[PDB]
Amino acid sequence: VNEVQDVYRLQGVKINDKHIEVIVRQMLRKATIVNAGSSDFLEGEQVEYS
């Protein structure tokens, strides 16, 4: 958020941070499993799935 809001505000462009936050929220929908008992113990899945 800070690093992109800086680019945007150097040009005087207002954006609420909610939007960057949701883009990030999408950027990390995946998770790699460590311990298990129902999953393959080593793969990347949806954090909503886990």
> Which residues here bind another protein, judged by CB under 8 A?
14-16, 18-19, 21-22, 24-25, 28
**Contact between residue 48 and residue 26 where contact means Cβ atoms under 8 Å apart:** no
- State the nearest-atom distance from the C-beta of 34 to another protein, in Å: 21
- The count of C-alpha atoms lying within 13 angstroms of the C-alpha of 37, restricted to the half-sphere facing its C-beta, is 1
CB closer to another protein, 16 vs 38: 16
- 31 backbone dihedrals φ, ψ, rounded to 5°: -145, 140
CB closer to another protein, 21 vs 36: 21
- State the nearest-atom distance from the C-beta of 15 to another protein, in Å: 5
